[PDB]
Ligand binder design. Sequence first.
Ligand code: BXX
Ligand code: BXX
Ligand code: BXX
Ligand code: BXX
Ligand code: BXX
Ligand code: CL
Ligand code: CL
Ligand code: CL
Ligand code: MG
Ligand code: MG
Ligand code: MG
Ligand code: MG
Ligand code: MG
Ligand code: MG
Ligand code: MG
Ligand code: MG
Ligand code: MG
Ligand code: MG
Ligand code: MG
Ligand code: MG
Ligand code: MG
Ligand code: MG
Ligand code: MG
Lengths: 855, 853
Amino acid sequence: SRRARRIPHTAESVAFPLGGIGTGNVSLGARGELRDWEFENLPDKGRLNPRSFFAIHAAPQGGPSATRVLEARSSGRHDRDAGYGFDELAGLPRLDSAGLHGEYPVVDIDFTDATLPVTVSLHAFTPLVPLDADASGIPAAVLRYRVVNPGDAPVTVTVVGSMSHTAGRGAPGPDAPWGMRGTQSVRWRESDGIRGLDFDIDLDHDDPGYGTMSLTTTDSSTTVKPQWVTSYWPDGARLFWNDLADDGLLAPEARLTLEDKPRGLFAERDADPDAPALTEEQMLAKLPRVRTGSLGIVHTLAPGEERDFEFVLAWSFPNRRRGWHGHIIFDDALEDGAPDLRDELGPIVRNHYAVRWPDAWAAAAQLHRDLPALEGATDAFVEELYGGSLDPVLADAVGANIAALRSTTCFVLESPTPELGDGPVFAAWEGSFDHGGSCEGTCTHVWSYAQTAAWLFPGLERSARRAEYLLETDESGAQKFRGNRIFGAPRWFIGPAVDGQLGTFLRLHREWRFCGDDEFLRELWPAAARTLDYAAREWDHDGDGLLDGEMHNTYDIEFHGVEPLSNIIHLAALRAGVRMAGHLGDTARAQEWALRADHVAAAIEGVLWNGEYYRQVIDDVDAHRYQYGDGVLSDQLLGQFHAFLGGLGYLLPEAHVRSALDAIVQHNHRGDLRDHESTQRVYALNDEGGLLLASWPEGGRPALPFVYADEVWTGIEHQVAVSLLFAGRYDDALRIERTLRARYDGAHRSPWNEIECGNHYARSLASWGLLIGASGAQWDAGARTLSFDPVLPGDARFLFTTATGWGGVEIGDDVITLRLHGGALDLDELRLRGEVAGRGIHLDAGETRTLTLTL
Amino acid sequence: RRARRIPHTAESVAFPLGGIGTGNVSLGARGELRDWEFENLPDKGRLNPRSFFAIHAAPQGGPSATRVLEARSSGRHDRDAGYGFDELAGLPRLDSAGLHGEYPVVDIDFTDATLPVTVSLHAFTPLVPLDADASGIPAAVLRYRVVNPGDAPVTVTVVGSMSHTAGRGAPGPDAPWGMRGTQSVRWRESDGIRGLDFDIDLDHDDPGYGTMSLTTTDSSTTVKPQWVTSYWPDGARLFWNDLADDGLLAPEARLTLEDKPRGLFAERDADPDAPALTEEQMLAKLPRVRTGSLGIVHTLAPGEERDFEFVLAWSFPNRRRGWHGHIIFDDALEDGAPDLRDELGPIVRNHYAVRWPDAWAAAAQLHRDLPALEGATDAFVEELYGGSLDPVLADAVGANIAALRSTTCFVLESPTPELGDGPVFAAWEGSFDHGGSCEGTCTHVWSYAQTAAWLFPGLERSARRAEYLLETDESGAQKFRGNRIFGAPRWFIGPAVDGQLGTFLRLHREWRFCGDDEFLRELWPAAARTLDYAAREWDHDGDGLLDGEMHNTYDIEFHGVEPLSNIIHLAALRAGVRMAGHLGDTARAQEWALRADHVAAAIEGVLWNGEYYRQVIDDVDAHRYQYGDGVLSDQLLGQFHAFLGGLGYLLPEAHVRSALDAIVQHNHRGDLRDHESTQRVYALNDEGGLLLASWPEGGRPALPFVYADEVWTGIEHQVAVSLLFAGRYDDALRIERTLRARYDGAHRSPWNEIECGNHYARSLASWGLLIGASGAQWDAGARTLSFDPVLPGDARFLFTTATGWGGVEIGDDVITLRLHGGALDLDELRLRGEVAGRGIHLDAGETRTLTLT
Ligand SMILES: OC[C@H]1O[C@@H](O)[C@@H](O)[C@@H]1O
Ligand SMILES: OC[C@H]1O[C@@H](O)[C@@H](O)[C@@H]1O
Ligand SMILES: OC[C@H]1O[C@@H](O)[C@@H](O)[C@@H]1O
Ligand SMILES: OC[C@H]1O[C@@H](O)[C@@H](O)[C@@H]1O
Ligand SMILES: OC[C@H]1O[C@@H](O)[C@@H](O)[C@@H]1O
Ligand SMILES: [Cl-]
Ligand SMILES: [Cl-]
Ligand SMILES: [Cl-]
Ligand SMILES: [Mg+2]
Ligand SMILES: [Mg+2]
Ligand SMILES: [Mg+2]
Ligand SMILES: [Mg+2]
Ligand SMILES: [Mg+2]
Ligand SMILES: [Mg+2]
Ligand SMILES: [Mg+2]
Ligand SMILES: [Mg+2]
Ligand SMILES: [Mg+2]
Ligand SMILES: [Mg+2]
Ligand SMILES: [Mg+2]
Ligand SMILES: [Mg+2]
Ligand SMILES: [Mg+2]
Ligand SMILES: [Mg+2]
Ligand SMILES: [Mg+2]
């Protein structure tokens, strides 16, 4: 019995990512293969790790043995240009089928095979502990193979992991013989309560490419080949399979190379033949530089017996080259006016995880030592996220997209700049191209959509807000939307985006509301208030209160005229600003902004509202390229998404907000795209559906609309779905999410990778809002109040988080129950549907309280 | 349709257009162009921006339809940044398609539920047997046939949009926007054709320089010669607006919609109040690829079919001098041959550039000569695919021609003065996706390749000249990878036994095909030395059998005494006696004939085990990479050559058949799911194939040779050919059915058999299937042509000879020759060992039917 939908081994795009926040990753495919080896501070989809696989030797008592790689057979194209290569070991026998059942962060892959005399499943995960970014940021994974004997005789089983270290690649050069800038090492090690293989490399400690790996177990019943033979030809693999398939046991290799000297095709041109053998060490110095080892675990299973064969795979690449080194913020794109600290600071910035764990073994030792608590938290998380009342579609959308936050798109730097003081700083690309970062600078117009980190790892988001307000905001309140100064470099010379700058203000409110830390807010307040004032002063040119004229946005273009994206975000920002200003005692600003907001709201209703939705008012929709006029913009109510999430309620008349959301769905949602015409980028096509960025149901399409109008972005789908949940439009929210997640169901794209400008795209983290909207969760740390208001009536059960603690809430039978899995919770009031359920509620981790509602 | 329908869902399938040495572009089973590789390197997976065909169909008094002329995509859609702008993946397409390939011709039939017309694409690059230049045009026909099945007229526009491919450079100040030069496109009408002519402002001798064109002879055109270039993709949007509006196009009044760099594209250091930029100045700051559209417009009556015919041509005439590969490095060279490179200069030209120095020249030729070129191509297809061969065998023979016309092979114009003026054939072993695989016209690989020797023999002769005149030393040591064609010093690695002696067998093959004794005499001093080298240097125990360490195609050395080396040597000696005796080299004729009889006796006394031939060695594990009493699939490779060379059986017939039977019985696998290989994979899962070796009687080494557990199509082919000659038809057919099933489109492409690279040269062993099936024996010296089909009864085959090619049709009482090209002047025609005619002459276009009594 599996709760998650079975994804077949034929679904080639599927990749379940292991790893945690900022650690880099390796993934499991639906065949149970390891893939996408990307530990080294850059994405690397498709990177093959030579000779890195799990295998089984099953020896039935009195029967023929079977030796297989623990993967389902490949399918689809087999036309590799040089065949599947030696180091892929594609020619070893594999299993009939598999089914992958992912409830991120946990996966189960159940193998089926008619020849193997045992049945195998893989359970794998990297712990996720809500509100604990370090515990959720271990550079390691559990790979636990459960083996069952369904037969009638005992079977002696060996499960063996064979692994190469990934470190050391280099571009052709005198420093990179054999494509490797250093020689790897591997050794058997037993220390720190664990045992297994410890990999290293003789690169300098400060080399960006320096790193370690380990494959370990706490199981005493091991058989090992610590280092495979390194020859010119792949003798090592052949000898490994001979050794395993013979007896299910392994031995260390007596000779680490079978070469005596360079010979034949490998001979040195200027070499004397009849020259005698070199020593083993001299010969190894001339040979390939990757090392491989095998760790086996051996147990005999009686008929009906089940046993776990448990491994940890760990890694460490502590060093990043200082700087984004992206594709936007080049030296010819820096402004002066902020001094360049980069010389004065080292050329390396460390990954935060490398402070706690100096190398791979340290991370493995911790994961193994603390496994019961780390796994127990992870399991409690999974049960609350996937085992509650949410439609499975919504739980899928919320949980699967956490992978983006734990992907190469995001990372955590240790003390990159003295301007922020000491400690970790979260930063991120927008996305991950297959082999490089996409769109540097913790881009504010994109990241404003992302909600997941604000509810699961709020300290990360706070650390980023500090960078924006302390480093990227000038004295006028102009804020950059890509941040370069985290690295001690000058700012990017491009100026503000309206969505970026005002969405960052909204996020400051969100962060402050979650944590209740007025000192956090006070530090950033002079800068933040300037960025809100900047809008009314600089972006309203006709004095009506509506932002108007040329403003840059997340569509990489400027809107002209007067339109809702900018204005409804501004309205939301003003309302948030009143809450913050008022609480801090900035009473003058609070009253000014409240009155401004009232005017903005009336002007939006008077000008942008058309009786059905909000739209762009412009003299001539074709005067400027890249406009939309009377089209329906899916993001017209983005401000209202933030407002709902921020506890600010409706910004505009409820019937008009619901009308506009209904118009977005009715006009912009496509169930099928056969008849769609787009010259734009494709994230949805053919017999898929999706929410278009814009459409023109009443005409008025420009010759050249904004450049993404005909596209489908999951982040925009999510935000609209969220708003629909808050507005009571459940069926339409579910329609949007079912349609979107169908595009990511494994058939054509992976559930764990929603894409836009890059894999693991930050905008996809809008999805967390589905949980908040479905549950009506409103946590106000300043007031110490928690309320719920589920979209659907009757019984409900959801995950929730707050700054102090996390757990489950269960509603129904005229009661409300809180169960706290981590931290603490101290509530002045708990409300349900606007009514007080209880006062003065104090819980610690492991406790539950059930309150009966008033009749 | 005669060819099997491959569905549009078969993503690996790619039908390659282009010819010998031209570079290529392919059509996938969706009808899409893919694998743009014109520029003297492979480039599988290269996307050409904004390069596609579209249709506008405007029913009289009905709503119009505008579609890209491609079937819907399928499979994985998880591109990291989505399908990009320039792929135009979001435009409406046709529901489905079926691809019917009889290489060199393809038909792609589209199906759509709503389009008001039906469409098919017929495409080809001509192939004219025995005419390598006519088969080497850097152009293709793309002929869209549109049918109006309705009862009202429909006005149809078929429009080709294209971008030139030239100009890429590594990111840097030298390649703004990824481009080292700026492209140009214009409307042109000259040389009897019209359409779009593309160029680039790179220097005339730049390796990256080239041209492209999209042309028609149809007078009914509508054109947008140059799309708008903006920072954003305004060009494509304006194109589709223009096509979908009315099915007609216009030139763009403005070639960019930018006035100056602004916003995200602003120059930080730009004077914010600078003088206005001209259009030409603004273009200079913008992407450097250019795109144009050529439309053909016709109103189709109810029931009417009309062809919308285009030619796509290209020309990248300049190659860097050298292989620039991954084996023959400038510090892997030996001294002793003069380095001519500084004198000759850094470029060598493609031979096709002599006739066709730009794209328009090639197009103009293809259009002008299309009736003759297409007629020859069509006759070729009818003979190869429309005769009596089992369709599996016709598929294996014909589809693999693609390797010869791929990036694996090329033809240099006068690369070295040491060979005199004219074309020189040279080749990789294969094509990696983005680079050549294994340079040097590798002789141990190319010895398996038969297709060029029967279809384009002059190419093979030019390569033999390089090997004997440039790569053979005074001792008779021949290199197996050639550098001297470029004027470069020789590779330092020494000879391979299969390569050196296989080349000698190919010299005999070439000479027998062409009958030119001057060709043979020029090469004879060197060639004779290479055969004598073997008995002198490779037989250490003086028993006549080659023994000890010898390098081979498996990239290792066999030790002991074994049949691959020895049976090839036997074959080469028999060929040597034929050549020596004809030349009047009576000394060598007698010496080699004695040596050959001794070798045959010794093979039978030592290597034969009563069932097959095997390696005799003290300890199969003493040296890595041996095989001992295993069954080596290539053990009778020499006999494959002998059969094709008219030398018959080398060893007792029953022994040769027993060995072949052992190879089939022991090495052929119907299913590979339980196979245990740590080697490379060209066959797996529920596929079958012929393993390189197996150990049915035990004696498997711990570390056998490094490819023993693999499956190579070239070795499947050679064994299947030998089985045909030995009368083991059913087993040959099973081998071929099993291997071609691996390339049926479900997992791999029919037109790309793989080994160390795509389009692998060893796969050209497949031609021998036609030879074996038909029993064709052409001896130009004797002017005799004979056939001896494996199967009884009526038969109909393609054949080739030096002078002419066509079809042979065999019946009970008669044999018919139909000649499609050239001429045939036979001393004697034989069928099944009997004389069928004497003094028979035919010219192209003639048919003669001769009585067998
Ligand atoms: O296409 C890349 C190719 O380059 C060589 O290293 C091949 O092994 C590989 O497949
Ligand atoms: O896909 C669009 C996104 O990609 C980047 O250019 C961003 O600026 C933009 O929001
Ligand atoms: O579905 C019919 C088409 O009409 C336009 O709105 C397109 O988006 C849509 O796909
Ligand atoms: O595949 C890697 C990615 O790098 C960037 O150029 C993207 O366009 C591309 O898709
Ligand atoms: O696939 C094997 C082939 O690849 C190259 O190394 C050739 O030498 C060899 O014959
Ligand atoms: Cl946190
Ligand atoms: Cl404009
Ligand atoms: Cl020729
Ligand atoms: Mg890649
Ligand atoms: Mg170490
Ligand atoms: Mg063993
Ligand atoms: Mg202004
Ligand atoms: Mg205004
Ligand atoms: Mg549907
Ligand atoms: Mg589908
Ligand atoms: Mg509600
Ligand atoms: Mg590629
Ligand atoms: Mg020109
Ligand atoms: Mg038009
Ligand atoms: Mg001997
Ligand atoms: Mg299949
Ligand atoms: Mg005549
Ligand atoms: Mg004549």
